Every structure is written in C-alpha cells, then in structure tokens.
Amino acid sequence: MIVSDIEANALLESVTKFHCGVIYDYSTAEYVSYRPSDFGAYLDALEAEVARGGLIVFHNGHKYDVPALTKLAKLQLNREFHLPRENCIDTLVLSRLIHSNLKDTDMGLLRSGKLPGALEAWGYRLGEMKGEYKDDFKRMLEEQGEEYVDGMEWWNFNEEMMDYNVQDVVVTKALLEKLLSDKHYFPPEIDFTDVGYTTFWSESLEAVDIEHRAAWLLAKQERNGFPFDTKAIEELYVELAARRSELLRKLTETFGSWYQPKGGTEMFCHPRTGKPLPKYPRIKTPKVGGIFKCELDTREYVAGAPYTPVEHVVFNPSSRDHIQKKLQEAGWVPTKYTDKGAPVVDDEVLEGVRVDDPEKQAAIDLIKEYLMIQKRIGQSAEGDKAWLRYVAEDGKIHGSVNPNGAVTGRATHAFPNLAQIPGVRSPYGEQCRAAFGAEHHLDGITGKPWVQAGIDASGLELRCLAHFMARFDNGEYAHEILNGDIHTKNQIAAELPTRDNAKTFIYGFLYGAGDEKIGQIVGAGKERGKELKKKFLENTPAIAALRESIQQTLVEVKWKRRWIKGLDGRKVHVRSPHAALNTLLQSAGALICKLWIIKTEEMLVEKGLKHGWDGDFAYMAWVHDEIQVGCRTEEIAQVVIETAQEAMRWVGDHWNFRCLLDTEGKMGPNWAICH
Amino acid sequence: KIIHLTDDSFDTDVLKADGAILVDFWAEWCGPCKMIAPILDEIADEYQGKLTVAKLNIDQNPGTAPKYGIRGIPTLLLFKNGEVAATKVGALSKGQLKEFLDANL
DNA sequence: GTAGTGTGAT
DNA sequence: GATCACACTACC
Ligand SMILES: [Mg+2]
Numbered sequence: 001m002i003v004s005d006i007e008a009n010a011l012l013e014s015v016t017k018f019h020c021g022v023i024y025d026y027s028t029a030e031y032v033s034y035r036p037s038d039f040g041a042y043l044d045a046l047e048a049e050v051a052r053g054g055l056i057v058f059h060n061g062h063k064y065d066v067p068a069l070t071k072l073a074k075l076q077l078n079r080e081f082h083l084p085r086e087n088c089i090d091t092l093v094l095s096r097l098i099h100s101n102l103k104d105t106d107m108g109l110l111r112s113g114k115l116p117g118a119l120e121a122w123g124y125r126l127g128e129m130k131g132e133y134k135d136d137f138k139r140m141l142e143e144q145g146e147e148y149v150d151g152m153e154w155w156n157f158n159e160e161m162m163d164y165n166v167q168d169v170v171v172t173k174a175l176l177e178k179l180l181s182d183k184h185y186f187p188p189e190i191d192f193t194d195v196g197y198t199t200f201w202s203e204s205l206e207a208v209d210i211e212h213r214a215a216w217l218l219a220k221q222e223r224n225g226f227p228f229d230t231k232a233i234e235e236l237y238v239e240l241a242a243r244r245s246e247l248l249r250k251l252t253e254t255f256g257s258w259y260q261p262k263g264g265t266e267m268f269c270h271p272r273t274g275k276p277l278p279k280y281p282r283i284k285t286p287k288v289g290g291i292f293k294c295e296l297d298t299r300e301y302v303a304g305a306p307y308t309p310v311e312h313v314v315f316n317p318s319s320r321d322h323i324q325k326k327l328q329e330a331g332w333v334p335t336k337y338t339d340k341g342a343p344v345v346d347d348e349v350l351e352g353v354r355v356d357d358p359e360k361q362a363a364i365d366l367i368k369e370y371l372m373i374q375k376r377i378g379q380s381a382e383g384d385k386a387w388l389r390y391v392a393e394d395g396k397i398h399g400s401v402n403p404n405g406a407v408t409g410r411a412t413h414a415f416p417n418l419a420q421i422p423g424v425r426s427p428y429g430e431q432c433r434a435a436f437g438a439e440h441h442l443d444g445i446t447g448k449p450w451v452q453a454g455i456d457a458s459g460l461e462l463r464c465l466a467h468f469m470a471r472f473d474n475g476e477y478a479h480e481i482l483n484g485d486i487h488t489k490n491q492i493a494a495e496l497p498t499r500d501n502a503k504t505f506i507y508g509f510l511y512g513a514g515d516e517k518i519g520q521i522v523g524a525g526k527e528r529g530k531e532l533k534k535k536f537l538e539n540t541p542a543i544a545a546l547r548e549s550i551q552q553t554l555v556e557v558k559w560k561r562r563w564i565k566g567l568d569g570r571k572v573h574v575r576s577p578h579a580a581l582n583t584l585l586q587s588a589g590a591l592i593c594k595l596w597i598i599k600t601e602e603m604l605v606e607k608g609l610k611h612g613w614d615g616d617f618a619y620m621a622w623v624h625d626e627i628q629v630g631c632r633t634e635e636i637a638q639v640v641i642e643t644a645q646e647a648m649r650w651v652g653d654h655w656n657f658r659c660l661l662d663t664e665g666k667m668g669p670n671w672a673i674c675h
Numbered sequence: 676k677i678i679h680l681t682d683d684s685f686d687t688d689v690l691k692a693d694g695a696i697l698v699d700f701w702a703e704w705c706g707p708c709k710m711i712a713p714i715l716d717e718i719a720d721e722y723q724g725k726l727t728v729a730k731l732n733i734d735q736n737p738g739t740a741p742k743y744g745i746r747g748i749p750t751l752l753l754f755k756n757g758e759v760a761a762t763k764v765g766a767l768s769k770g771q772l773k774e775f776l777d778a779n780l
Numbered sequence: 781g782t783a784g785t786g787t788g789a790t
Numbered sequence: 791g792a793t794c795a796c797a798c799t800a801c802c
Binding site: 410 | 781
Binding site for chain 4: 316318319320321322374375378379382383384385405406407408410412413414415416417419420509510511512513514533547575576577578579580581582583585586590624
C-alpha cells in the first residue's frame with residue numbers, strides 16, 4: 001500500500017502540467033518526492049504498486065488525482081495511464097462514509113464558516129491546503145514588493161508547493177489510519193495497510209466497497225456532463241425577463257413608492273424633557289448653516305435644526321416585507337407569523353389573502369406570478385449558480401455530486417444542483433427539462449444526436465416500507481403492492497374519499513406533510529388530519545409494530561444507540577427518534593439505488609458497451625431514484641433500459657429484499673420526454 | 676390658514692398660484708416635522724396676505740416629493756411663479772423661519 | 781458575508 | 791413523524 005498526492009496547475013477541466021507528487025510506501029516507510037521532470041518516474045511507481053496487486057491511497061483521488069494523471073500522462077508524455085478502480089482507495093470517500101453525520105467543505109469549494117456542526121480535523125486541513133498555500137504565496141510576494149495576481153500560485157512549480165505536497169501525504173496517511181481504526185468497518189484482526197487489493201475489499205464491511213464504486217462511477221458522470229441547450233435557455237430568459245418587466249410595470253403602478261428613514265445618526269430626543277426617543281427614526285443635526293452669511297446662505301441646512309434623513313423606496317415584488325406592508329395597508333390581517341414575529345408571506349398565505357380593493361386583490365396574482373418568474377430566472381440565468389453560468393465549452397453542464405452527501409446515504413448535488421430542475425408539471429418546467437438532453441449532444445463521429453434513456457425505480461419508498469414490515473405482516477403489504485392496489489388499500493385504511501387522496505396521504509408521511517397538511521387533503525385542518533393519521537395506523541398494525549421495533553433498538557431521551565444499521569451494514573445516524581422510520585426508509589432506498597446504478601453500469605460494460613461520449617452510453621444524471629443515460633443509438637437505449645431492470649432484480653435478490661423491486665424506463669431526446 | 680395639498684392639487688395650488696407659497700413636505704413618523712408643525716401654524720397666521728403656507732404629507736401623497744429630490748424632512752420649499760425660490764431642510768425655530776422668510780420675500 | 785425566509789427536487 | 795441546494799432581501 002502506498003499513499004500519494006500530486007500538485008498540478010489547474011482543476012481537472014483545464015490541467016496541463018504536473019508540478020510534483022509525493023509517495024509514501026508502507027513497505028519501506030519512506031517518503032519520496034517527484035519534481036516536474038520526475039513525472040514519468042512518478043507514474044512508474046504507481047504502476048509498480050498496481051503490478052504487485054497493491055493499493056494506492058489518495059484524498060479525493062477518485063474525482064481529481066486519478067483522472068488528472070490519465071489526462072496529464074497523455075498530454076505531457078504521450079503515455080496511456082489508467083489506474084484500475086480496484087487498486088484505489090480515497091480517504092475523502094472513506095471519511096464521508098464513516099463520518100456521515102458531519103459536513104465537509106468538499107475540498108475548499110464551501111466556506112467552512114457557514115457549515116453547521118463540527119468538522120473532522122485532518123479532512124479540514126486537507127480541504128484548506130489550497131487556501132493556506134495561496135496565503136503563504138501572497139504573503140511572500142508582497143514581502144518582496146511584487147504584485148499578486150489571482151491564481152498565480154499554481155502556474156509554476158516551487159519548493160513551497162513541494163512542501164505542501166509532502167504535508168498532504170503526511171496528513172492523508174494520518175487520516176487513513178484514523179479511519180482504518182473504526183472496528184465497525186474494518187475488522188481489528190486485520191492490518192489493512194498490509195494487504196493486497198482483493199483482501200481489502202473482501203474483508204472490509206460491504207459499504208466500503210460500495211462507496212468506492214459509487215464515487216468512481218459518479219466522478220465519470222461528472223466528467224461526462226449533461227448536454228445542455230444553451231440557445232433555448234437564452235431565449236427562455238428573454239421571454240421571462242420581458243414578463244418580469246411587464247409585471248413590475250403593473251405592480252409599481254398599483255403599489256406606489258414611499259419614503260423610509262435612512263442614514264440617521266443620532267437619536268431623536270424630546271425637546272422639552274430631553275427624554276431619548278429610541279423608537280422615532282434617527283435624525284441628523286446640521287453642524288453648519290444659517291439664513292445669512294447680508295448675503296443669503298443658499299445651503300439647505302441650519303446649524304442646530306434637526307431633520308430626518310430619508311430614502312425613496314420603489315415597490316419590490318421580491319421583497320416579502322414590501323408585500324406585507326402594502327397588503328396590510330389594503331386591509332389584510334395576518335394570522336400566521338414567524339418566530340422573529342414577521343408575518344408569513346408565502347404562496348399558500350398569499351393565495352388566501354382577501355382585500356376589498358379589486359385591483360389590489362388582482363395584484364396578488366401578479367405578485368405570485370412574479371415570484372415564480374424570478375425563481376426561474378434566478379435558477380436558469382441570473383443566480384450565482386445559474387445554468388447559463390455553468391454550461392461549459394463542450395456544451396454540457398458538469399454538475400458536482402457528493403455520492404454520500406446526506407446522513408442517510410443519499411447523494412447531494414451542487415454547482416449547479418441538477419437534482420432540483422423544475423419538473424414538467426410546474427410552470428415552465430417543460431422548457432427547462434427539455435433543455436437538458438442527450439439530443440443536444442452530437443456524436444463525435446457522425447454528428448447525429450444521441451438519445452436518452454430515463455429509468456426510475458418504481459414506488460421505491462413503499463416497497464422499502466413493505467420490506468421492513470414483512471417481519472410483522474408476512475409480506476401482506478408487499479403482496480398488495482405488486483398484485484393488488486396498495487393505494488385503494490390505504491384509502492380504506494384511512495377514510496379519505498378518493499384513491500388519489502390516499503396517494504397524497506401516503507407520500508405525505510414521507511415528505512414532511514404535517515397534520516394540517518393532511519386534513520387539508522380532504523378539505524380541512526389539523527383535527528381531520530390528526531384523526532386520518534391515527535385511523536390509518538390503527539388499520540395498519542404492521543406499521544405501528546415496525547415503528548415500535550425501530551425505537552426499541554434506539555431509545556431507553558436516553559439512547560441505547562444513536563444509529564440504525566443500513567442495508568450494507570453501515571451506521572446511519574438518527575437525528576430524532578421521531579425521524580427514525582423515515583431515516584430507515586430513505587436510507588434503504590438510497591443504498592438500493594446506489595448499488596443499482598453501480599450494477600447497471602457493470603452489466604453494460606460486461607455486455608461490451610463502452611462508457612463515454614467516445615463510446616456507446618454515458619451516465620448524465622442520477623437523481624435519487626432515477627438515472628438519465630445518454631445512448632449513441634436507440635438500440636443501445638433499449639439495452640440500457642432492459643439491463644437496468646435486470647440490475648434492480650439482482651439488487652433485490654442480493655439483499656434478500658422481501659418486496660419485489662422494479663424499474664420503468666422511457667426513451668426520448670431529453671429530460672422533458674424521459675420523465 | 677394652512678393649505679393642505681394633495682398630489683393632484685399641487686400643480687394648481689402651488690405652481691400656478693400668485694404670490695409666495697411656502698410648502699412643507701412632512702410625515703407623521705418624523706420627530707422634527709412634529710416640532711416645526713406648531714411653528715408653521717403661527718407663521719401662516721402672522722404672514723397672511725403676505726405668504727401662503729401649505730403642507731404636503733409625503734405618505735398620503737407619494738408622487739410630488741420625488742420630483743423635487745427630497746432627501747430629508749421636514750423640507751420647506753419656497754415657491755415663486757411656479758419655480759422653487761429657496762429651500763431649507765430641518766426643524767427651524769420661529770426666529771430662523773421669520774428671518775428666512777423676511778429675507779426671501 | 782450572515783440571518784431570515786422560501787422554493788426547487790426525491 | 792425527511793434529505794438538501796440555493797436565491798433574494800435586509801442589514802453590517
Ligand atoms: Mg490534493
């Protein structure tokens with residue numbers, strides 16, 4: 001086993017030069033430094049470890065070091081270098097598995113200061129190295145009187161960089177050993193720094209292997225990117241922008257501008273008693289100024305004559321305070337307030353506001369439309385993370401994915417978040433989803449557009465629930481899902497009027513639907529919602545049994561254990577005993593979907609298909625229970641769809657799932673059609 | 676004696692009026708405006724036939740003030756022939772007002 | 781840049 | 791009785 005790290009001149013997308021690298025070999029216990037001209041020898045050392053059936057440890061190597069070395073080897077040495085997945089270990093991936101209850105800065109892309117909770121120390125240092133190096137560099141330059149230019153610390157190799165590279169491996173080794181010390185994932189009887197790659201994966205907990213396969217696959221997905229129709233969005237943006245201006249024009253006419261205190265320095269004090277008047281707006285008291293200089297003083301102020309500085313404010317529909325101010329003046333009486341005491345001003349509340357001025361009542365609809373238009377504009381074009389700001393030269397958006405970003409094992413997505421694109425059922429959703437599609441990528445050889453295969457796990461949440469309650473109902477629920485009609489079964493369990501009421505009700509328990517939100521499905525409130533839940537549970541004893549069994553393993557708020565064992569054996573941190581069941585369900589679904597996409601890609605590759613734009617298919621996005629895959633031809637799209645079903649069945653059998661697992665696939669040109 | 680203006684009556688009551696007109700742009704939430712109000716009442720009565728004192732509450736009449744670039748209140752604008760002759764911002768005392776007027780009339 | 785509020789998705 | 795990204799205002 002060896003631990004290593006490299007320094008290069010840029011992020012993966014544009015890296016062109018290897019600066020240095022360091023390798024620590026456990027078999028010799030020595031650190032070896034490789035400078036710019038030692039690049040070929042560096043690669044040779046890594047391949048020698050592979051020749052021995054060994055392992056290579058990197059921190060964030062799956063996303064950066066490994067693919068960067070392949071790229072740089074071809075570019076600088078005209079050499080084919082491809083480290084096999086099975087020989088690589090990533091301490092960042094390992095950290096996210098073992099310390100899944102903690103956030104991390106994802107190698108400095110996130111400000112550590114804004115994250116909630118504590119941060120693992122070694123990982124913190126590794127993520128901050130770039131920023132620390134830049135500060136040393138900047139400090140040294142200025143000490144010598146020369147100007148610092150953004151990013152210049154990475155243009156050339158220097159010994160300070162080499163020193164940071166060494167420190168990096170030192171810390172990565174420390175991190176590695178701390179992670180291997182966790183007996184839950186690594187049996188204490190084995191020294192994992194002294195085994196071949198096969199032993200490492202086979203003797204460690206299954207979750208270790210699964211997380212590395214997931215990270216390897218998702219790194220490839222990031223590199224593939226999601227083909228994006230830039231022109232379509234630029235045109236959508238003109239349309240939205242014009243509608244925004246028109247709504248603003250209409251709203252500013254209806255709601256006039258006004259003046260507010262602004263810039264006042266001193267406190268207004270009663271002129272007679274001198275009593276400070278903290279609540280009055282702040283004033284300013286001219287130090288100079290008079291009537292004459294006699295020649296008249298054409299200055300606006302008079303020494304000692306106080307005034308209140310004010311500013312002109314134009315109605316801003318994006319301001320929930322402006323909205324609240326104008327609606328109350330129109331006679332609106334707020335009923336829902338926030339902790340800070342502010343009136344709630346969201347779409348549901350606005351939908352319910354009634355004022356007698358006809359034009360102002362109608363303006364509420366304009367305001368809601370305006371908020372929605374802005375939402376779309378911010379996401380597609382104006383926000384810091386807008387799609388138009390991220391689309392690359394290859395015409396694709398390469399969104400980042402943290403394979404194990406959430407406590408439950410779900411992945412998190414960002415830069416931009418491709419897991420939050422408006423659905424086809426929402427306003428402008430069809431145009432948004434249509435702009436993301438394999439059709440927008442032209443084949444590198446033939447110029448013909450690729451086609452898309454959209455595959456989703458069918459009702460995964462209910463099947464996970466069925467699985468876990470099988471211990472209590474012997475598969476009754478699972479049997480109903482796949483043979484009868486689980487929805488009408490739940491409809492009867494509860495009392496809800498129609499079948500669709502049951503579908504809303506059930507999903508409600510899953511996605512934070514409170515009692516008021518429940519009763520509000522049949523046209524009521526809390527009570528008719530608090531009774532619907534109880535009634536449902538009394539008519540579905542297996543769910544109640546599951547809930548008590550889950551908590552008996554966690555509680556006696558003294559805990560017996562603060563985690564639940566996931567499908568692959570990992571610890572899944574439970575935040576609240578009340579959220580235990582959903583934690584259990586969401587985690588099962590996440591691990592099932594993770595193994596599923598891993599197995600699907602392996603089977604496609606086993607069938608001889610090549611992953612990549614220069615091949616047959618390309619993973620473009622993975623959004624929890626769904627994957628969008630670009631395919632060179634319709635025939636391949638068909639194979640992907642069939643293979644994904646086979647892979648899902650393999651997963652169900654692999655973990656002895658008590659409910660049969662299924663998928664449904666659709667072929668089309670884009671995400672709008674493959675929903 | 677004080678004329679209470681509106682946005683819609685401003686043009687006729689101020690800009691097309693004969694003789695000097697002192698306009699006070701005020702708001703009820705301003706401490707200083709409250710201080711000078713009592714003063715303006717005595718000025719209107721004392722300068723009648725010589726000057727016309729008018730008030731425009733900027734909250735109920737939001738259209739006018741912006742046209743004159745108000746940045747603070749109270750703001751006293753002295754109009755003559757539809758043109759702003761003079762201007763002072765702040766809660767002046769009776770004396771500072773009397774001398775401001777006498778001097779500008 | 782932080783705090784408060786909301787909306788986008790599973 | 792859920793997980794998480796991100797924008798926009800208001801204030802420092
Ligand atoms: Mg590194």
